[PDB]
């Protein structure tokens, strides 16, 4: 039993019940799964394993979630618990690699207590010493714990980790797991947030990545859906994967924003106000304008700091003594440099001590002990500088975001947002919001940042909107209200530049993304194609840096450029590798100094994606000086010292 879409082929072994995934490769197909079993109900603590195989229907024919294709349905039984098992796979024509899974669960005469659903498993095939995953979850470790992860076969350790989205998780539901030859991504396939997990695990000589979801009782005689999924099989690195998932979740509505649509000042070299931390003045970064607009910075945040409280986002008269004016004095000098300004805010959050609290306790989440619940840090917890999360659905706590929204642009001049330091959304239990069920609010969080950013639009079509999940990846639905996603407070180059890759995947290589601005790394910055920002106040050797680097990502502009993940494979090409296209010009970006991947000794540098029939100079246009005089494209390869990295260009000689 088989089904074909676009690079994909699924094989269904019906004695041993199970799926294998291959991918194409030339006139070829490589196997990228082991067989894996089809995914079960949890009951008692115990996945059920005594499913037996009924049917298997293929129909090559056929229209689904993704348009003509194939599909291929699987019924099992369980005698011990009266189950039958429908699971849906569907392959499209047109989307390459992708697979679309749905499954559904009868019950016989007794209802049935599942405590959890796993949708689909898939063990990597063909893995030798290592395997490379990206893992979505939003449980943390916030900051210090990186999205992606070696898996190493040849230590002690066995790799585990559930990647959750939750009322203590709001991240990406995906994960990848890959190789040299590839690799398997699986997300979940919905339109809305939802609580699923996408376990990625170490297993005796491989590794495995699956999705499951939170289970039910299943009333005698019915049948329910229990989720749905995406896999997508790739060759490449964790990029190709995720773009497969952008691919597909078009097909569901979750659109990323187009190109054409970006505004300018979303591609602008940044400056953000923490040169003097919370003792920022109006007149501290008005003094700094002269020499940063001379430096080429086009785009100021107004940071942390400026406000009352959460919730009632009013001007703090300490740093306003003078009001709105003092706001409009700020914006306006902005402006009068060329440049836009952005104001940060905690979007969720309604306070504690606000007004916002004491006068409408009703906008709020409420905890199931009846109290007003916190924001929730990554896998719970909540922190002293956040609030009482409103409810998504109480109008009154909209309300006060658009309100925020259209303070900030018409009455003080801002030009767009910077959210930030917030990550979930606790379920609420207030019977006056007449929740469907408690998990409504947690699911309903992106309509937060839905509602606000189209109030944004409203007053500017041009307005710049950020969110960072600081030290987590980026709340998913939240997505596609953005204009810049920031890497969002990495810890590391490792974190900053591996992360532009995994949302430029998700996101459109035309996407704009920053590195941002943790640690000092222009050249992590200017080589991934991001944009590079800045918080110092610099002086000396520091600040003369700043410059030369603003110099370079204003004259290169690669941030405008389209990137290219489709031609390095992180962990398995020789160096972490990055590739810009701009003005026609292919930039590449060689790192040697990220300490979770970097060679042993000095491998020749391999320019892929040249025409093979010209011949070019590569430029390192970051010294002005020619590492290679003449190569052919298809024998791009040299061999130049260099400690950290090298930012070179391929230029075509005629
Ligand atoms: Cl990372
Ligand atoms: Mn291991
Ligand atoms: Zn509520």
Known sequence: ?????????????????????????????????????????????????????????????????????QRMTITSQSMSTGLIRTYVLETSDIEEGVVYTATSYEAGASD????????????????????????????????????????????????????????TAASIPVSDIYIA??????????????????????????????????????????????????????????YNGLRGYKNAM????????????IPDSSYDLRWESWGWGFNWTIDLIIGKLDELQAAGVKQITLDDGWYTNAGDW???????????????????????????????????????????????????????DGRPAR????????????????????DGAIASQVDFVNRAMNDWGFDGFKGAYVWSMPECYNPAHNHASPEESTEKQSEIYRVSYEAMVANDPNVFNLLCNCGTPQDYYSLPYMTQIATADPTSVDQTRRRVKAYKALMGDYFPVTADHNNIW????????????????????????????????????????????????????????????????????????????????YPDIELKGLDPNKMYRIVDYVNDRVVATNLMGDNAVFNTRFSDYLLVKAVEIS
């Open 250 to 261: 078009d097909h569901l509505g979750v659109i990323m924003p187009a190109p054409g649509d």
């Open 522 to 601: 222009y050249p992590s910055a200017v080589g991934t194609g991001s944009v590079l920002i800045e918080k110092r106040d610099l002086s000396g050797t520091a600040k003369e840096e700043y410059e030369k680097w603003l110099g370079i990502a204003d004259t290169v502009q690669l941030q405008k450029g389209r990137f290219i993940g489709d031609l390095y494979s992180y962990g398995f090409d020789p160096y972490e590798t990055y590739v810009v296209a701009a003005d026609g010009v292919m930039y590449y970006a060689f790192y040697k100094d990220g300490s979770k991947y970097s060679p042993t000794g």
């Open 181 to 238: 030859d590839g690799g398997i991504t699986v997300g979940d396939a919905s339109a809305t947030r939802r609580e699923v997990h996408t376990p990625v695990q170490e297993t005796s000589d491989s590794a495995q990545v699956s999705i499951g979801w939170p289970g039910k009782v299943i009333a005698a005689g019915s049948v329910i859906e229990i989720g749905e999924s995406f896999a997508v099989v790739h060759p490449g690195d964790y």
């Open 375 to 394: 924001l929730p840090t990554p896998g719970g917890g909540t922190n002293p500088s956040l609030g009482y999360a409103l409810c998504p659905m109480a």
């Open 314 to 368: 009013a001007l703090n008269p300490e740093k306003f003594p003078n009001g709105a004016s003092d706001a409009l004095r700020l914006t306006d000098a902005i402006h009068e440099h060329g440049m836009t300004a952005l104001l940060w805010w905690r979007p969720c959050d309604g306070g504690i001590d606000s007004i916002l609290y004491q006068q409408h306790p009703e906008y709020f989440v409420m905890d199931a």
């Open 1 to 69: 039993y088989a089904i074909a879409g676009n690079g994909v082929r699924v094989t269904y072994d019906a004695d041993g019940q199970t799926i294998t995934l291959y991918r194409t490769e030339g006139s070829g197909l490589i196997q990228m799964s082991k067989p894996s079993p089809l995914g079960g109900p949890v009951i008692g603590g115990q996945e059920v394993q005594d499913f037996s195989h009924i049917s298997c229907d293929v129909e090559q024919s056929t229209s689904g979630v993704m348009g003509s294709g």
């Open 112 to 167: 049935v207590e599942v405590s959890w659903f796993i949708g689909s498993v898939y063990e990597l095939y063909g893995a030798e010493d290592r395997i490379w995953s990206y893992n979505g979850g939003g449980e943390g470790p916030m900051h210090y714990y990186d999205t992606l992860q070696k898996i190493d076969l040849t230590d002690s350790g066995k790799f585990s980790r559930e990647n959750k989205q939750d009322d």
